């Protein structure tokens, strides 16, 4: 009399929200963009190769200056690179070698990392001594830690394998807000360029939108068949793209509240590990299990090129804030920068 | 190239050499992923060659370092650490991945060995299993197999 009624109410709410989405689904993005000119074939070559890691590279991030990047690896080493000159700036040893994520603070005074130790650890890169020391280790996540992203020098959101997200205050070391609406392990994050919202994909094949200050889920996006491994905001913050294990990318948008485009080819069966956007949002770069990344025309959903210089599963890729280059990491322990 | 850039290059080279030393130190070690039910007699063998997150164990037999990663305690999904553990040489299983070998132990290519009274035989068996998987990675590394 109670559980059945609540289930029926949830089902009818889902039906009505799907009907509302269908009502505004009169047009299609492909139909609108059929008239525009094709982007054409794009050849992008490996301009820099960064060597020094002795294990599979799992994460990388760019600095907001677009010159410095930090990469994590299974050898228990954080390496800050100078992409212009290929030479290393720092090498931060880690207590645990099972790190799965790394973040670069937008100011540049801190870096973060985390993994199977259930801790995103903040490292102070600007000390009076010439060493990098661990500023603080944030604990409280039940499961592993798959992504943490810096909001500012004092705030950071973390996604975790305990189906939750959390917003931390670094000085105190405690969570300020928690985000609990997912069902499966949260595998990815992407902060909006205004630092007001973020999207998180999980193993329940759904992506959710959160307001950082509100602390509650705002929109839920479905459509993928398997777990979502990557997520990325459109440059204007009004849309986002998801990559999953069922070998397809999907572009969702927040205002219309539904999927707009599907990026899949019959020649691709391997899953998707990473996804990013060009500075204008016209290109969508997705990395795959089949050892190479390929470029997608974001408005026409056709391939425009391939990044095929890696010898293993491309696990990470990212584009600079000024859009001059994209850096990809793989399990062959090399980082390549493409222009 | 300026003097400051030259000194930065020198710093990068010193970091490179430190990384080389650490990698040479870690090249003589082997990582083994240990699975179990948590209450299936695994602790007996764990303490047999012994003498939140994942537990690490260290034990040496003949100039070769083994790391044991007991993951039976974690209740999380089985497949969600596989992408993290995709590179381990072998997986040890205690009972009462297209090219990752499995080592099997009986408390009471797949390699099987019934537990003996002395842990020496068990350690020798696991050492032999790691030898074979290292032989075959070396062969692939070469080009033959």
């Amino acid at each position, epitope marked *: 009399s109670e559980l059945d009624q609540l289930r029926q109410e949830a089902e009818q709410l889902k039906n009505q929200i799907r009907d509302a989405r269908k009502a505004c689904a009169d047009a299609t993005l492909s139909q609108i963009t059929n008239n525009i000119d094709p982007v054409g074939r794009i050849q992008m070559r490996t301009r820099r190769t960064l060597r020094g890691h002795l294990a599979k590279i799992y994460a990388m991030h760019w600095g907001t200056d677009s010159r*410095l990047l930090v990469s994590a690896s299974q050898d228990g080493k954080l390496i800050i690179w100078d992409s212009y000159t290929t030479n290393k*700036v720092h090498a931060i040893p880690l207590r645990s070698s099972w790190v799965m994520t790394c973040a670069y603070a937008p100011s540049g005074n801190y870096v973060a990392c985390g993994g199977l130790d259930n801790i995103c650890s903040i490292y102070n890169l600007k000390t009076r*001594e*010439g*060493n990098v020391r661990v500023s603080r280790e944030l604990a409280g996540h039940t499961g592993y830690l798959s992504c943490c992203r810096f909001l500012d020098d004092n705030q950071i959101v973390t996604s975790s394998g305990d189906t939750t997200c959390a917003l931390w205050d670094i000085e105190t070391g405690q969570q300020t807000t928690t985000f609990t609406g997912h069902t499966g392990d949260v595998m990815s994050l992407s902060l909006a360029p205004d630092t007001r919202l973020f999207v998180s994909g999980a193993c329940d094949a759904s992506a959710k939108l959160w307001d950082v200050r509100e602390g509650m889920c705002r929109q839920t996006f479905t459509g993928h068949e398997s777990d979502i491994n990557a997520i990325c905001f459109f440059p204007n913050g009004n849309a986002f793209a998801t990559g999953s294990d069922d070998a397809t990318c999907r572009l969702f948008d927040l205002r219309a509240d539904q999927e707009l485009m599907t990026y899949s080819h019959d020649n691709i069966i391997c899953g998707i590990t990473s996804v990013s956007f060009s500075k204008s949002g016209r290109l969508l770069l997705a990395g795959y299990d089949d050892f190479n990344c390929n470029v997608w025309d974001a408005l026409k959903a056709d391939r425009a090129g391939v990044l095929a210089g890696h010898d293993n599963r491309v696990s990470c890729l990212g584009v600079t804030d000024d859009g001059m280059a994209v850096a990809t990491g793989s399990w062959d322990s090399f980082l390549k920068i493409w222009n | 190239l300026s003097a*400051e850039d030259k000194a*930065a290059v*020198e*710093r990068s080279k*010193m970091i490179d050499r430190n990384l080389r030393e650490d990698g040479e130190k870690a090249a003589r070690e082997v990582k083994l992923l240990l699975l179990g039910a948590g209450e299936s007699g695994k602790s007996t063998i764990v303490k047999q060659m012994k003498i939140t997150g994942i537990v690490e164990t260290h034990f040496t037999f003949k100039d070769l370092h083994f790391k044991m990663f007991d993951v039976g305690g974690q209740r999380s999904e089985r497949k969600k650490w596989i992408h993290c553990f995709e590179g381990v040489t072998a997986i040890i299983f205690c009972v009462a991945f297209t090219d990752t070998s499995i080592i099997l132990f009986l408390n009471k290519e797949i390699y099987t060995h019934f537990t003996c009274a002395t842990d020496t035989k068990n350690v020798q068996f696991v050492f032999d299993a790691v030898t074979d998987v290292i032989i075959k990675n070396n062969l692939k590394d070469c080009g033959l197999f």
Partner: single-chain antibody
Amino acid sequence: DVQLVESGGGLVQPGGSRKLSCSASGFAFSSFGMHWVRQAPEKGLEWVAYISSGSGTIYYADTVKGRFTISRDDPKNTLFLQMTSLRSEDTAMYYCVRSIYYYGSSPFDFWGQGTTLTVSSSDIVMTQATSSVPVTPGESVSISCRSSKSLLHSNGNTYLYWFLQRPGQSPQLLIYRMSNLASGVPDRFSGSGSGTAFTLTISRLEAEDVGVYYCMQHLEYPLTFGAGTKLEL
């Protein structure tokens, strides 16, 4: 905290030998390249020698090459300057200077207190036209420095450094690479210039802004200083 303490010297007969020691504490001594800088009584700064991190690279001034030997003891965080065949021109106050080099770093941050040595008896030229400028407090003052050649490089950064030596104290960095503000110094210090001519601007003058200001180039070795400019109240 970070501190460099110097020892040795004080009275040396001409033609003799001496050993200056610089004991460091409070920071990772091994990661920093270390400089020796001396200033004669009533004279500006003068870079002496440089030993890099890991002892890989060593430089000497042309006036001390052969007679001086710089070395470090990383286990004990100690810096040495073996000085031999000492001349009457070698009497000065010797400073032990801390510097590290990576992208976005500030070298020449910390200076030791100094030790006095009394001896009984092709490169870039940095020029400061003025020597003594009396300014009342609260008035913006401009300090200029000129270079023999352009300090701008292909990287786009010009290697010009500014130091302030208060009366009775060792110099402290306030501007590195002609634009950046050193850690811990007030925001009223600003640096500008283009290639050859440079200007340091102080907005409001407190009682702690009184001292001698030095302009330094780090484009190539030997490192060169300019004749300091003194501010009076």
